[PDB]
Amino acid sequence: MLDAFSRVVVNSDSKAAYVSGSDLQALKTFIADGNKRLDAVNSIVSNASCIVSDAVSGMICENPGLIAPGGNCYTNRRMAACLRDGEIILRYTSYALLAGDSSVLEDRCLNGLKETYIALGVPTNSTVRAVSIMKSSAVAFISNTASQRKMATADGDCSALSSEVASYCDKVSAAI
Amino acid sequence: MKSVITTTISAADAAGRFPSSSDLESVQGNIQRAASRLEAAEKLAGNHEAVVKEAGDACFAKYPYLKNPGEAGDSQEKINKCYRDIDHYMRLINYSLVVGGTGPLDEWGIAGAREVYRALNLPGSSYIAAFVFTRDRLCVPRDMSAQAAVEFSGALDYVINSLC
């Protein structure tokens, strides 16, 4: 897997170039916002169960056919698999947020996920709805705008990390 | 690509774990040591032509037999390839300093270097001479800060030990 620094290195390696001053400055900005990035990851992981459960419950509430017979969340086994998949997707999104790069998420969760879901009959629309609810909740937790849970952080702007979380979830949705 | 971030995320993923206090702490170590290793990378990246030239000159001075026919560097093109190889290694060291881990070196210069150099009759001692000269050539605080020097010499010692 790649992190942000290794991503910059891979881009530099394509031209046999040493890591340039601009890429170095971008990585120094990544480092300077490193504490905010750690706070964002902490916000996501400290609420991971609530995020995943809320997303799956909202996906089911907006699509009641999921829990009907023949629906893909019908039995307790399918419900547990759906919650586990939501947790896995959130875990790899948090991995991407910690790394600053999408490589871990893509290669270790999104590679073959669409084909696997097609083979299993997992509805892609409901999956992206759950992923988007996870995106909204995780973004709120990054921004500390969750209504029922506030985490103390130094005042500041984490919109870049919020956009990173949204972009990782969007990569998940676009993969499937 | 071995680094602090990739190592702890790989450990978390192997156990199927969300990032926890230990992973964030290791990334904090990334934040703390990044200043020194990125200073070393910037110095190397901005001065790699001279450093590579000096390393290659030291390699050929310590092993003039490389110029003899049938040896590595018995043609001008092969000497240029030797300096290009030292360039490759110095660039991989710059990548390792930027990354904060030996991953770039491990995957791009070390992984198959034994078989490549055995097949092409390239003695590892010549590369070792270039890198040992580079490590001993670095002066503090003339070229780098103390900790930047620590990181740079650590990468150089890592590649030397990969060749030893």
């Epitope: - | 590579v52 030239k53 240029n80 300096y83």
Partner: single-chain antibody, 225 residues
Framework: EVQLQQSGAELARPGASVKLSCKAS????????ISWVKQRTGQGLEWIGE????????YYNEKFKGKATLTADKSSSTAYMELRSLTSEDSAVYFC?????????????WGQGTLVTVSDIQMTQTTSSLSASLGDRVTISCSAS??????LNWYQQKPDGTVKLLIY???SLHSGVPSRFSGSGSGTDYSLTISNLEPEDIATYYC?????????FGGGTNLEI
């Protein structure tokens, strides 16, 4: 072929800044560096600094640090020297030369030379002026302050002012140099030998070590017939 066209002679005032130019053609700009050499009126060559456009890295002689600033434009394949705080000491002819990377670190091709108005290895050329006749075998010898490793270049500076690389690595002839020229030396002492002298060989000859930065030239030997 390689040309390295330079900008025209620029006149300035003390305290002002001059942005010299050197447009490169006939080769891949990023495969070589651009070195700048200062030559005062009737004096020897002096390496200002080198820039490698591939990385943008600049290496300066300590005597010209802040005084000269090296930049390059890969899109236009040109290099710039920016002189700051101009004085009477900066009145000289400034050359741009194609610089090789690692073992080919030679000023292979020079510019016409832009005239501007208002621990180092010491390269000593003991005989600053030599006189000979056609067909003579003249020897131009120079010494290095410390031991170099055959990393010596010889340069022919015509009375017109153009500079050409004659011999690199102490023995290797350049692309267009006839076999009449030869070089020798292994340690600190090196010699340039011209056999069967011709009128085209009337020039000033400089030996340049590239063992250790900063690159340093010899004082120069003027050869007249």
């Amino acid at each position: 072929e390689v040309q390295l066209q330079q900008s025209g002679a620029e006149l300035a005032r003390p305290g002002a800044s001059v942005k010299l130019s050197c447009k490169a053609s006939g080769y891949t700009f990023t495969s070589y560096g651009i070195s700048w050499v200062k030559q005062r009126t009737g004096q020897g060559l002096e390496w200002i600094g080198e820039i490698y456009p591939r990385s943008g890295n600049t290496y300066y002689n300590e005597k010209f640090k802040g005084k000269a600033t090296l930049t390059a434009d890969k899109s236009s394949s040109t290099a710039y020297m920016e002189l700051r705080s101009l004085t009477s000491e900066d009145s000289a002819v400034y050359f741009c030369a194609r610089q090789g990377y690692y073992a080919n670190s030679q000023f292979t091709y020079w510019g016409q030379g832009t005239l501007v108005t208002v621990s180092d290895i010491q390269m000593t050329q003991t005989t600053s002026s030599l006189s000979a006749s056609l067909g003579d075998r003249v020897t131009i010898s120079c010494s290095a302050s410390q031991g170099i490793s055959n990393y010596l270049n010889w340069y022919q500076q015509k009375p017109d002012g153009t500079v050409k690389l004659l011999i690199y690595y102490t023995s290797s002839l350049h692309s267009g140099v006839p076999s009449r020229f030869s070089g020798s030396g292994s340690g600190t002492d090196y010699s340039l030998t011209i056999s069967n002298l011709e009128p085209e060989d009337i020039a000033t000859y400089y030996c340049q070590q590239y063992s250790k930065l900063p690159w340093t030239f010899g004082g120069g030997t003027n050869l007249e017939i």
